[PDB]
Amino acid sequence: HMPANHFGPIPGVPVGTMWRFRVQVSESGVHRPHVAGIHGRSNDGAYSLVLAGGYEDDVDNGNYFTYTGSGGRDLSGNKRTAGQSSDQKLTNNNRALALNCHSPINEKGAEAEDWRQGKPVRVVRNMKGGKHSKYAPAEGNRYDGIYKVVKYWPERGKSGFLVWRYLLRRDDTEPEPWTREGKDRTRQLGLTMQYPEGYLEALANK
DNA sequence: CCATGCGCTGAC
DNA sequence: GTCAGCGCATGG
């Protein structure tokens, strides 16, 4: 049983694994938080993240992608999501993710002196990210492997407010689940969409 | 205690 | 199509 602050792959969970709901991704240990896009500790780093089209500044290009930090939002009224209404800060999860980069934390942003030496980050792609990405799975959530933070920096987002941006690159020995090799691999391993026990039946009665 | 939150579902 | 909020895990 891996501790909550484990870095790297989760034993027994191969690249290409799929789950229908976020709570299922949590139970596997791959990505503990069931709502937040980032799982991290401000004095340690980020352990994993999910691409789900929640932030307009996100850019997905497969082996490379640009992630936005969280926050700069007014969640008053017991919300979990909203548009940008204030500038983001390099604290909490945003600070946790910056620490993965192989360079001293820099309030103004920084680049890695040999990205590969950075802390590994488990990445999950959710289907809501398919609206603006051809890498997103058609259904559910999919584990795509290990990535590293090549660099991060602040800049005015499409909303006009300041947002934190991270450039992540894949560093995994397993073929991408979206390539020919990946799709064959998933087939040879017999991986299939996992659903909560009783879910398919409950939804079939409808 | 107290904030944060890239989900999810039932309503208009 | 879009939207108002709710339980709960995680961290400090």
From Swiss-Prot:
Expressed in thymus, testis, spleen and lung. Within testis, expressed in almost all cells except elongated spermatids. The record marks 78 as: Required to discriminate between hemimethylated DNA versus symmetrically methylated DNA. The record marks 68 as: Required to confer preferential recognition of cytosine over thymine. Disruption phenotype: Mice display a sensitization to DNA damage and replication block, and die in mid-gestation. Keywords: Acetylation, Cell cycle, Chromatin regulator, DNA damage, DNA repair, DNA-binding, Isopeptide bond, Metal-binding, Nucleus, Phosphoprotein, Repeat, Repressor, Transcription, Transcription regulation, Transferase, Ubl conjugation, Ubl conjugation pathway, Zinc, Zinc-finger. DNA binds at residues 52-53, 58. Residues 8-170 form the YDG domain. Residues 55-58, 67-70 are annotated as: Required for formation of a 5-methylcytosine-binding pocket. Transmembrane segments: none annotated. GO terms for cellular component: chromatin; cytosol; euchromatin; heterochromatin; nuclear matrix; nucleoplasm; nucleus; replication fork. It comes from the Eukaryota. Ubiquitinated; which leads to proteasomal degradation. Autoubiquitinated; interaction with USP7 leads to deubiquitination and prevents degradation. Polyubiquitination may be stimulated by DNA damage. It is found in: Nucleus. Induction: Up-regulated in proliferating cells, and down-regulated in quiescent or differentiated cells. Early induced by E1A in postmitotic cells. Down-regulated by aphidicolin. The record marks 80 as: Required for affinity and specificity for 5-mCpG sequence. One of its GO terms (molecular function) is methylated histone binding. There is a cross-link at residue 134 (Glycyl lysine isopeptide (Lys-Gly) (interchain with G-Cter in SUMO2)). GO terms for biological process: DNA repair; heterochromatin formation; mitotic spindle assembly; negative regulation of gene expression via chromosomal CpG island methylation; negative regulation of transcription by RNA polymerase II; positive regulation of protein metabolic process; positive regulation of transcription by RNA polymerase II; protein autoubiquitination. This is E3 ubiquitin-protein ligase UHRF1. The chain holds residues 418 to 622 of 782 of the full protein.
